[PDB]
Amino acid sequence: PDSLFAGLVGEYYGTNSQLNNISDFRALVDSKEADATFEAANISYGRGSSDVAKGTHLQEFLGSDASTLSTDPGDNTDGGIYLQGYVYLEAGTYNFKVTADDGYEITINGNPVATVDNNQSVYTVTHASFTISESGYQAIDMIWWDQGGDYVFQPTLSADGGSTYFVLDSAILSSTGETPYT
Numbered sequence: 001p002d003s004l005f006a007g008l009v010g011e012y013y014g015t016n017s018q019l020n021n022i023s024d025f026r027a028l029v030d031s032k033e034a035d036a037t038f039e040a041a042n043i044s045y046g047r048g049s050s051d052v053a054k055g056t057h058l059q060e061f062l063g064s065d066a067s068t069l070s071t072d073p074g075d076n077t078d079g080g081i082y083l084q085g086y087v088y089l090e091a092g093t094y095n096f097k098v099t100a101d102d103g104y105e106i107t108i109n110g111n112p113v114a115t116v117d118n119n120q121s122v123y124t125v126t127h128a129s130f131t132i133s134e135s136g137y138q139a140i141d142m143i144w145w146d147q148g149g150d151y152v153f154q155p156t157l158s159a160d161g162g163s164t165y166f167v168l169d170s171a172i173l174s175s176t177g178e179t180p181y182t
C-alpha cells in the first residue's frame with residue numbers, strides 16, 4: 001500500500017562524484033536506494049549555501065517538507081531530489097517558470113516541459129507552453145540537483161499565459177492520484 005498525501009513522493013540521493021547534467025543525476029537515482037525519502041508538499045526549496053548534501057543543508061532546503069524525512073543523510077559533496085506523483089490541472093495551456101541552482105527536468109504525462117541540462121548559479125527560466133488535454137490528476141515527475149555551492153529550486157506554473165504563477169503544493173498535489181483529504 002502506498003501513502004496517500006497531498007504532495008509528491010520525494011527521494012533524495014547524495015554522491016561524492018560530480019553531477020554535471022540530468023543524465024548524471026538520473027544514473028545516481030538508478031544506482032542505489034534513496035538516501036532519504038520525504039513528502040514534497042510545498043515545492044519551493046532553498047536558497048542556501050555551502051552544498052545541499054552537507055550537514056543540515058538538505059533540511060534547511062526542504063523547509064516545511066523536512067519534517068517528513070525518513071532519515072538524516074550523511075555528508076556527500078553533491079546531491080539532488082527525484083519527485084514523482086500527480087498534480088490536478090484542468091484542460092488548457094500552461095507554462096513553467098523555474099528558479100534553480102543547479103539544473104533540473106520536469107515531465108508531465110511522460111513529456112519534458114522544463115529542462116536545464118547543465119550546472120548554473122541561480123537563474124530563472126520562463127519555459128515554453130504546453131497543453132493538458134483532459135482535466136484531472138496528471139502524472140508529474142521532477143529531478144533537481146546541486147553539484148556544490150549554492151542551491152535553490154522553485155518551479156512555478158502559470159495557467160493564464162504567464163500573467164500569474166503558483167507554487168505546486170498541497171492544494172493540487174497527490175501522491176497516488178486519489179483525492180487527498182489531509
Ligand SMILES: CC(=O)N[C@@H]1[C@@H](O)[C@H](O)[C@@H](CO)O[C@@H]1O
Pocket residue numbers: 101102119120121122146147148149150151
Ligand atoms: C556561490 C555560488 O553561487 N556558487 C555557484 C554554484 O552553486 C553553482 O553550482 C556553480 C555552477 O558552475 O556556479 C557557482 O559556483
Ligand SMILES: [Ca+2]
Pocket residue numbers: 029030031032033034
Ligand atoms: Ca533508486
Ligand SMILES: [Ca+2]
Pocket residue numbers: 053054055056057072073074075
Ligand atoms: Ca545530514
Ligand SMILES: [Ca+2]
Pocket residue numbers: 017018019077078147148
Ligand atoms: Ca561536485
Ligand SMILES: [Ca+2]
Pocket residue numbers: 101102120146147148149150151
Ligand atoms: Ca550549486
